[PDB]
Amino acid sequence: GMYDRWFSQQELQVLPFAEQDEQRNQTWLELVGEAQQLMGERCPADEPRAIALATRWMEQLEQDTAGRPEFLTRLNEMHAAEPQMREQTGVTPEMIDFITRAFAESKLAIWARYLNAEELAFTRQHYFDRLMEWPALVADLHRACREKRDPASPEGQQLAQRWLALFQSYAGKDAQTQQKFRYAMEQEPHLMKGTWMTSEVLSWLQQAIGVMMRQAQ
């Protein structure tokens, strides 16, 4: 079995995509149908329909991976490697790329109200630079939260420093710009949609960052 070569039996018990679910299949039929439509029209990634689709799409993926970021990586790799996956779902690499760009536009459209033109141009340019490293970090943040580790611990501060590096890769290294991203997150919860970042894990990360800022302040 395809799913058996890609996931452990313990993972297949927790993976919603493993379970039969007619509602979920109908939802994905509609998501893929709308993607094909918009791509057929050559709809730009910043069009309101593209932004709305990408948001719903990523929220659906968050549900169907049970909020486990490492299952997103696995599913992307399966789609790249397994012709049977592309047949089953109708999701093409072009489609994943379209959704990836529209999802970025959905964040940039919110940030545009909190950043100056220069900060937004930097973030638009550098958004994708280290994008692929986020799932592994979000996974480790999920583990640190569940294993109720101390944000102030050396291992907690290793996660805070890893977060800072990935964040600065798209935000830049200006302390004032970082506070604008923080303010945007506080004012616009919709920024967190499709990021695998639950309020519980964000709260833990916020504590770890708090410690990091005050040590060498």
The residue (of 84 and 145) whose beta carbon lies closer to ligand A1H1Q is 145
Cβ of residue 199: shortest distance to ligand A1H1Q, in angstroms? 12
Cβ of residue 151: shortest distance to ligand A1H1R, in angstroms? 26
Cβ of residue 172: shortest distance to ligand A1H1Q, in angstroms? 12
Nearest to 178 by CA among 189, 165, 197, 190: 165
Q: Which stretch binds ligand A1H1Q (CB under 6 A): 28-36, 82-90, 132-140, 153-161?
A: 132-140
Instruction: Compute the distance between CA of residue 111 and CA of residue 184 in angstroms, rounded to an integer.
Output: 7
- Which residues contact residue 141 at a Cβ distance below 8 angstroms, ignoring those fewer than 6 apart? 159, 163, 197, 201, 204, 205
Q: Which does 195 bind (CB under 5 to 8 A by kind): ligand A1H1Q, ligand A1H1R, none?
A: ligand A1H1Q
For the chain, the distance separating the N- and C-terminal CA atoms, rounded to the nearest angstrom, is 54
Q: Is the distance from CB of 111 to CB of 120 less than 8 angstroms? A: yes
Among 53, 72, 138, 212, binds ligand A1H1R (CB under 6 A): 72
- Residue 143 in contact with ligand A1H1Q, rule: CB under 6 A: no
Q: Which stretch binds ligand A1H1Q (CB under 6 A): 22-30, 84-92, 117-125, 133-141?
A: 133-141
Nearest to 74 by CA among 127, 128, 15, 162: 15
